[PDB]
DNA sequence: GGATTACACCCAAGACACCAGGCACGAGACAGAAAAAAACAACGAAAACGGCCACCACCCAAACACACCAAACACAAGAGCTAATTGACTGA
């Protein structure tokens, strides 16, 4: 488990899904901190594919896969690649709430 | 009553004379000065020994100046006017 440093996902929990051997970027699973392009022209909430398909805009659909604004990849839950220098790989220690979410 | 005038009188010059006190020599011996050996203070030579006393700091108790600091500066009342992040950094 890691936490991103920059962007709109500062100090947000990310589950390390796949470690790419290239030692450049690692695939991370995140909860979308987005408003589905409704007010902007945000808390952590479950990803609503139908909402972003109804609102339209920059969106590409592959059934359970999605590519939307910000070059953001989502599946079923964002699965996006970020550099290890942009995350912290030591000292996250998630709680039971994050286990349910992902002496 | 000092001195004079007059009237008895007893103490001693002088006499020889008795003779043992006194004086000119003589001897056993003795208190003492000449000489010598040994302690001794009078009086000046130092020294120690206090000894007040005038220093050299010594230490604390004001005396005085100065300067820095903080806190104060009458009540009420009405109205209007303006500001209350800010250029800009960095992913995207």
Swiss-Prot record:
Methylated by PRMT1/HRMT1L2 and PRMT5/SKB1. Methylation negatively regulates interaction with P-TEFb and RNA polymerase II. Phosphorylated by CDK7 and CDK9. Phosphorylation by P-TEFb (CDK9) at Thr residues of the C-terminal repeats alleviates transcriptional pausing and promotes transcription elongation. Dephosphorylated by the INTAC complex when transcripts are unfavorably configured for transcriptional elongation, leading to premature transcription termination: dephosphorylation is mediated by the PPP2CA component of the INTAC complex. Dephosphorylated by the PNUTS-PP1 complex in termination zones downstream of poly(A) sites, thereby promoting deceleration of RNA polymerase II transcription. It is found in: Nucleus. Ubiquitously expressed. Residues 1-29 form the KOW domain. It comes from the Eukaryota. Residues 36-103 are annotated as: Interaction with RNA polymerase II. Belongs to the SPT5 family. Interacts with SUPT4H1 to form DSIF. DSIF interacts with the positive transcription elongation factor b complex (P-TEFb complex), which is composed of CDK9 and cyclin-T (CCNT1 or CCNT2). DSIF interacts with RNA polymerase II (Pol II); forms DNA and RNA clamps that stabilize Pol II elongation complex while maintaining the nontemplate DNA strand in the transcription bubble and nascent RNA in the exit channel. This interaction is reduced by phosphorylation of the C-terminal domain (CTD) of POLR2A by P-TEFb. Component of the DRB sensitivity-inducing factor complex (DSIF complex), which regulates mRNA processing and transcription elongation by RNA polymerase II. DSIF positively regulates mRNA capping by stimulating the mRNA guanylyltransferase activity of RNGTT/CAP1A. DSIF also acts cooperatively with the negative elongation factor complex (NELF complex) to enhance transcriptional pausing at sites proximal to the promoter. Transcriptional pausing may facilitate the assembly of an elongation competent RNA polymerase II complex. This is Transcription elongation factor SPT5. It comes from Homo sapiens. The chain holds residues 278 to 416 of 1087 of the full protein.
